[PDB]
Design a protein around this ligand. Structure first.
Ligand code: MG
Length: 219
């Protein structure tokens, strides 16, 4: 049987993207720039804070000094950090808490494989810290998803090979990273978005220990 499950945060455990989008939209509103909507925001995922700000400024050809740029990046982050103070156990996706309990009770290791720079805080706010054996630090990852590095790191941080692990992801890049690490992917979403060559469930209520064991046995 598999020995570990490697979780992404966003789109699996919780909607982590939303508060970043909110904070960017608020910043843009404050300075009179229109166009920070959800399709635009897809262009900010995985992008640095400063490169993200520059994209927003570019929507209006808005010119700013280095000092004003620094203030704006700071303000968005301040607002974001304020917003995430309100994260709670209610922000946990359906099925995930029970899955975590069942994995733990079966002595299956649990690791986070997320780019989130606020992963540990967010798991604390959701009261999930005690279920996690390790969190892979994204600051120590040389290459982001779809590179496998962060999944390999998450497996290693719990003392297993990725080949002993299942990875859970909602993104095409994350599924590729899981494949390339040697772990077994189980996607959440649509085959239209994630491909027809992996096991996919339509939402996180389908991620149960019994389903993961079935999948493992049938691979
Ligand atoms: Mg994800």
């Amino acid at each position: 049987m598999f020995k570990a499950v490697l979780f992404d945060l966003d789109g699996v455990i919780t909607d982590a993207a939303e508060y970043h989008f909110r904070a960017w939209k608020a910043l843009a509103e404050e300075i009179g720039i229109n166009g920070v909507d959800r399709q635009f925001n897809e262009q900010l995922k995985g992008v640095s804070r400063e490169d993200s700000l520059q994209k927003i400024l570019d929507l209006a050809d808005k010119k700013v000094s280095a000092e004003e740029f620094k203030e704006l990046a700071k303000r968005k982050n301040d607002n974001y950090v304020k917003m995430i103070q309100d994260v709670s156990p209610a922000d946990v996706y359906p099925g995930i808490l029970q899955l975590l309990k069942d994995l733990r009770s079966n002595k299956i290791k649990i690791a986070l494989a997320s780019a989130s720079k606020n992963g540990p805080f967010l798991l604390e706010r959701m009261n999930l810290t005690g279920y996690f054996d390790a969190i892979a630090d994204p600051a120590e990852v040389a290459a982001s998803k779809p590179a496998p590095d962060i999944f390999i790191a998450a497996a290693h941080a719990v003392g297993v090979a990725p080949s002993e692990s299942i990875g859970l992801e909602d993104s095409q890049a994350g599924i590729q990273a899981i494949k390339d690490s040697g772990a077994l992917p189980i996607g959440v979403g649509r085959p239209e978005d994630l491909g027809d060559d992996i096991v996919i469930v339509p939402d996180t209520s389908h991620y149960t220990l019994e389903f993961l064991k079935e999948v493992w046995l049938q691979k």
